[PDB]
Amino acid sequence: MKASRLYTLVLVLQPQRVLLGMKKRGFGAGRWNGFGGKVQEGETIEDGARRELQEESGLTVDALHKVGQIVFEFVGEPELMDVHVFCTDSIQGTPVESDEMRPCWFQLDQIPFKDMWPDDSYWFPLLLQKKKFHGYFKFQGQDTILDYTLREVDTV
Ligand SMILES: Nc1nc2c([nH]c(=O)n2[C@H]2C[C@H](O)[C@@H](COP(=O)(O)OP(=O)(O)OP(=O)(O)O)O2)c(=O)[nH]1
Ligand SMILES: [Mn+2]
Ligand SMILES: [Mn+2]
Ligand SMILES: [Mn+2]
């Protein structure tokens, strides 16, 4: 049994493009990703996701929808990362670079998988198909998956 810490991840997914951010420092630096971070005390997971989206991309959204949950384990780290994944298609301002992230739109036939976390190759296609999912990935360092599970689910 391991303890887990709550994180969020938000994908702004439109009909033909997705907004990603290049992580400029910290965890996962150098990889394109959705926006997110730790959930803080007192806020719902969805509201923490909205907050991180605003902080890292400048975008303010009224609502998100849950699309998946992914648990990450790292060799040498006792704490699991419990990542709650959300989407929205509906925005009304422009993305702006933050200290954490440089936002960029990608067409949906140009998803930059080689410059994303390796696990994203497995679950991101489900997100694109509008399937909901649960995943688990064990990493050695940043690059190497030692074990993983991925399951489509009816409810996140
Ligand atoms: N796509 C993808 N995202 C991941 C993976 N692992 C992982 O932690 N994430 C996400 C969850 C969070 O959005 C982010 C990690 O949190 P973070 O370090 O940005 O937290 P934060 O913004 O609060 O950190 P900080 O500003 O205090 O430095 O990366 C992964 O394998 N794939
Ligand atoms: Mn953040
Ligand atoms: Mn972050
Ligand atoms: Mn934060």
Task: Please give a structural write-up.
The protein has 156 residues and is mainly beta. The protein has a single domain (1-156), classed as Nucleoside Triphosphate Pyrophosphohydrolase. It has two helices and eight strands; from the N terminus they run βββαβββαββ. A hairpin with a 3-residue loop joins β1 (4-13) and β2 (17-23). The longest helix is centred in the first third of the chain and has 13 residues, at 45-57. The protein is globular, with a radius of gyration of 15 Å. Bound molecules: 8-OXO-2'-deoxyguanosine-5'-triphosphate and manganese (II) ion (3 copies). N(6)-methyl-AMP binds at residues 8, 23, 117-120. It is an enzyme of class 3 (hydrolase). 8-oxo-dGTP binds at residues 8, 23, 33, 35-38, 117-120.
